[PDB]
Design a protein around this ligand. Structure first.
Ligand SMILES: *[C@H](C/C=C/C(=O)/C=N/CC(=O)O)CCCCCCCCCCn1nnc2c1-c1ccccc1CN(C(=O)CCCCCNC(=O)C(F)(F)F)c1ccccc1-2
Lengths: 257, 246
């Protein structure tokens, strides 16, 4: 029944709102220009220095560390979202852990896109805006840790997806049966099938003009996966150059691979 | 209506059969059973005998490279059959082929594989998965991931009629770096995706979200292709012919 699917979609969007403080709707409202939500813009070292004044070791490091802690917060939110996904909690506790481990980053980057536009990314819950150019400036190797993400974002944001659509998509991503180490694939695959179903409908209903958005959207997983692998590599390098730099344990456990 | 999509699917199927000599249906008969069994290569002597029926890991690897080249031409001719593909800016065509060929090679390679091995020489022979893995590094783990991808891919239980469209979709990928005009490519891909979706519903009505699962497979493909070149670079570190193969 279409209604059965709609109900699932409603259930997910509702969990998504509850789980994530900064929706895409809000992020867009801040970026688009709708006088009380206006972000302080960071485009240089001075502005960065000022940013602290009102916004929430070394400059490049301090920024990199800022991301790390911020991702940890994302993992917590995503993890909370996952529990809401009908079925996920019933799954064998090991796989629950495995799906999270592989999914979390792909989701982080998908959602990160909601915060981005061609020339920058929102920071500190939307209180600030860091310009792409500044990040790109950052002393090597950090200089190009956000670059790939911006490229994905601009391509992804083009689909014009709404929080409602994303909630289901993010859900599909978590429940991927082909994740290394899975003990029970079949139970996971049946959940996804439902989600894929819920998404397929949602997109059709939400984006009637958008032909094959479902397929277009599913192809993006390729780009997400591509990004993650690039990041890991970059991380490898940073750990070697910067033996001083600490990594959050949660993040460090996910990268186990 | 759907008649256009069914026309496109039939057209692609017929072109696919013409372009590709050893089909999945045909490779499948050989794997399972049904005339002359292929010559089985499982050990060194079998390889040595095999040459006569039809310097180790290297000779084997070059032969895949030789066969890849052959496929590239077979894929090209097939690509040309795809409606709109020839009309495209010629630079774009060369590009879509240049970046699509590896992905398509492995897709079809899966048609030749089963959990225990892979058919070779238009099905005249069979190389064991065990023998391949054995091969000295880095050749050993080289094939091993394809088998894994194949096993998962084959589960979808696709047929030549389904792959034909699927093949087409890969070729018309609008992301490929350096494309001069994306709109028409995407526009055609969009039409292929529609055709594939319907083909899969009609052909595999019981299968739920097969279309979706097939589309997800592309991630695997790209990772495999990325791994492949990753290994190829490493090979580089260990006359005319270099040119033919490049
Ligand atoms: C980053 C996107 C990253 C994607 C990745 O994949 C990253 N991977 C990392 C990895 O290792 O794999 C793009 C930018 C988005 C995040 C930017 C967030 C805002 C900027 C950093 C703010 N911040 N947050 N936590 C810390 C910092 C920070 C950064 C730089 C210098 C100093 C600090 C200070 N700091 C604090 O937490 C104190 C903040 C006081 C403000 C009051 N607090 C609040 O507003 C509230 F609401 F109560 F939270 C700090 C100290 C130590 C370690 C981290 C931070």
């Amino acid at each position: 029944e279409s209604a059965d699917l709609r109900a699932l979609a409603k259930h997910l969007y509702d969990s998504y709102i509850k789980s994530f403080p900064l929706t895409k709707a809000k992020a867009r409202a801040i970026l688009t220009g709708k006088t009380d939500k206006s972000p302080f813009v960071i485009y240089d070292m001075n502005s960065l220095m000022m940013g602290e004044d009102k916004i929430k070791k070394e400059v490049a490091i301090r920024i990199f560390q800022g991301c790390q802690f911020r991702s940890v917060e994302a993992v917590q939110e995503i993890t909370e979202y996952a529990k809401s996904i009908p079925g996920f909690v019933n799954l064998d506790l090991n796989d629950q852990v495995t799906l999270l481990k592989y999914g979390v980053h792909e989701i982080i980057y998908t959602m990160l896109a909601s915060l981005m536009n061609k020339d920058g990314v929102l920071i500190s819950e939307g209180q600030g805006f860091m310009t792409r150019e500044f990040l790109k400036s950052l002393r090597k190797p950090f200089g190009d840790f956000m670059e790939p993400k911006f490229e994905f974002a601009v391509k992804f944001n083009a689909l014009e997806l709404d929080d409602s659509d994303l909630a289901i998509f993010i859900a599909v991503i978590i429940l991927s049966g082909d994740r290394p180490g899975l003990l029970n694939v079949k139970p996971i695959e049946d959940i996804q099938d439902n989600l894929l179903q819920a998404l397929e409908l949602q997109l059709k209903l939400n984006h009637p003009e958008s032909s094959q958005l479902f397929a277009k959207l599913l192809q993006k997983m390729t780009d997400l996966r591509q990004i993650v692998t690039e990041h890991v590599q970059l991380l490898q390098v940073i750990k070697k150059t910067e033996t001083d730099m600490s990594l959050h344990p949660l993040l460090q456990e996910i990268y186990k691979d």
